[PDB]
Design a protein around this ligand. Structure first.
Ligand SMILES: CS(=O)(=O)N[C@@H]1CCOc2ccccc21
Lengths: 245, 178
C-alpha cells in the first residue's frame, strides 16, 4: 500500500480516524454507518495489498531470481494479474468517493452518503461477469496451488531460501504463500457481511436503503454462481476420475 | 517456533468472529467491534513449547458448500462453535458440521466450544428463549454433545468478558501439537 492511504486507514474506526470536533457534529446512527463503510474500504485496501505481495514480491521475485520450470509460477499464483486489476479498480472508486467527500481544509474529515450505487456498479454488468469468471478459475485452482507450493518448498533448496528470505520481515507474518491464497479465496464471502451491516445503518435515506438492498442481492447472486462453477483441479488427475465425478 | 493452523467452524450466530477478534487483540474492543476477521498469526507458548498459531474464520462461507472446504487444507486443530444462547446452533453440530469436518480434516482434533457463556444467566435471553419452549444450553448438554461427536474436549468462554478465551486457544495449541 502507499503511505497516504495507509495513514488515512491507520485508525481502528472512522470515529477514531476523523477529528473529534468533526465526529461531535454527527448523530450516532451516521457514526455507526460510517464505521462499517470505513471497515469495507480498509479491508479492500488490505486485500489489494495481499494481491501486490503475490504479484510483486512472490511471483516477480521467483521469475527474476529462480530457475523454475515454465508454467510453475502461473500454477502457484493463478489469475493474480486479473484479480489485481479487478480490485485495484474497485479500490480506486472507493477511495475517490471518500476523497470527493472530504471537507475543504481537511484530509481526514468526510461522510460517504451514497455507497450503494458504487456497489451496484461493481457487482453488475461486465465487471460482475469478470469477477465471476476470475474467482471461478482462481478457486478451482486453489488446492493445486497449495500442493505445488508444498512440493517445491520440500524439494528445492533455492526455492526454500527465497521463501524464507522474503517472508522473514515481521510485516509479512500473516502473508506467506498459502496464507495469501486463502485470504484471496475468503475475500468474496466477506462482502455480504459488510454490506448487510452498512444497510442496517442506512435507513435514513430510502434511495440508499434500496440501493444497498439491490447491491446485497447482486453480491449473493455472484457468490452463488462462483460456488456452482468450482471443481478442484488436481495435477495428474485422470479423465476417468473426472467423468466419474 | 513451529507453525500450526486453526480454523473455527459453526453456524452464523455462534460468535466465532467475535471470539477470534477478542483473542487476537487481547481485548473486547471498546470503540468498534469489527464485522469481519481476515487472519492472524498468534505467538503462543504452551507447556514450554513455542508455536506460531495461524487463525482462520469460516464466517460468510456457511451457505457456499464448494467455497467453504477451501478453508480446511492442512488444518491442525478445529474449534467447533455453538452459542449457549442458541440451542438451535447446538443441534446443527452432530449431523452437519461434524461429518463435514471429519471428511475434510481426518484425524484432526476437534474442540467443541460453547460461546457467549455470560448469557446463561441473562434474564432477557431466558425470556426470549422461553417463548419457543427453550432455555440456554446447560453445561452437561455441551459436554454430552462433545462426547457423542468424538471431540478432543469441551470448553466454554465469553468473548464479551474475555473469560475462558485464553484457555481455549492454549488448549487448541496443545491439541495441534499432539
Ligand atoms: C453438503 S454440505 O456442504 O452442506 N456439508 C455436508 C454436511 C453433512 O456431511 C458431509 C460430509 C462430507 C462433506 C460435506 C458434508
Amino acid at each position: 500500500s502507499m503511505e497516504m492511504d495507509e495513514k488515512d486507514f491507520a485508525a481502528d474506526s472512522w470515529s477514531l480516524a476523523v477529528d473529534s470536533s468533526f465526529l461531535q457534529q454527527h448523530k450516532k446512527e451516521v457514526m455507526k454507518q460510517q464505521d462499517v463503510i470505513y471497515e469495507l474500504i480498509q479491508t479492500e485496501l488490505h486485500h489489494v495489498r495481499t494481491l501486490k505481495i503475490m504479484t510483486r514480491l512472490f511471483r516477480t521475485g521467483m521469475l527474476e531470481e529462480l530457475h523454475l520450470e515454465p508454467g510453475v509460477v502461473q500454477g502457484l499464483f493463478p489469475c493474480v494479474d486479473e484479480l489485481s486489476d479487478i480490485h485495484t479498480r474497485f479500490l480506486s472508486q472507493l477511495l475517490e468517493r471518500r476523497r470527493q467527500a472530504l471537507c475543504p481544509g481537511s484530509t481526514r474529515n468526510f461522510v460517504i452518503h451514497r455507497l450503494g450505487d458504487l456497489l451496484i456498479s461493481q457487482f453488475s454488468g461486465p465487471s460482475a461477469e469478470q469477477m465471476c469468471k476470475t474467482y471461478s478459475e482462481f478457486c478451482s485452482r486453489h488446492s493445486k496451488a497449495l500442493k505445488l507450493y508444498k512440493e517445491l518448498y520440500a524439494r528445492d533448496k533455492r526455492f526454500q531460501q527465497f521463501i524464507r528470505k522474503v517472508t522473514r520481515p515481521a510485516v509479512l507474518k500473516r502473508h506467506g504463500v498459502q496464507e495469501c491464497i486463502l485470504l484471496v479465496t475468503q475475500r468474496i464471502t466477506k462482502y455480504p457481511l459488510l454490506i448487510s451491516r452498512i444497510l442496517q445503518h442506512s435507513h435514513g435515506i430510502e434511495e440508499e436503503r434500496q440501493d444497498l438492498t439491490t447491491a446485497l442481492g447482486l453480491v449473493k447472486e455472484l457468490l452463488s454462481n462462483v460456488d456452482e462453477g468450482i471443481y478442484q483441479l488436481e495435477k495428474g488427475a485422470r479423465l476417468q476420475e473426472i467423468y466419474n465425478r | 517456533a513451529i507453525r500450526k493452523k486453526l480454523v473455527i467452524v459453526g453456524d452464523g450466530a455462534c460468535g466465532k468472529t467475535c471470539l477470534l477478534i477478542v483473542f487476537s487483540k487481547d481485548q473486547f474492543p471498546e470503540v468498534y467491534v469489527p464485522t469481519v476477521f481476515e487472519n492472524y498469526v498468534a505467538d503462543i507458548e504452551v507447556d514450554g513449547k513455542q508455536v506460531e498459531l495461524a487463525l482462520w474464520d469460516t464466517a460468510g462461507q456457511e451457505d457456499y458448500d464448494r467455497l467453504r472446504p477451501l478453508s480446511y487444507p492442512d488444518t491442525d486443530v478445529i474449534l467447533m462453535c455453538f452459542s449457549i444462547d442458541s440451542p438451535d446452533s447446538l443441534e446443527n453440530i452432530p449431523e452437519k458440521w461434524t461429518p463435514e469436518v471429519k471428511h475434510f480434516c481426518p484425524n484432526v482434533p476437534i474442540i467443541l466450544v460453547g460461546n457467549k457463556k455470560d448469557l446463561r444467566n441473562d434474564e432477557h435471553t431466558r425470556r426470549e428463549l422461553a417463548k419457543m419452549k427453550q432455555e440456554p444450553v446447560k453445561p452437561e448438554e455441551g459436554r454430552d454433545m462433545a462426547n457423542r461427536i468424538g471431540a478432543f474436549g469441551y470448553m466454554e468462554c465469553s468473548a464479551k468478558t474475555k473469560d475462558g478465551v485464553r484457555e481455549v486457544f492454549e488448549m487448541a495449541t496443545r491439541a495441534a501439537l499432539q
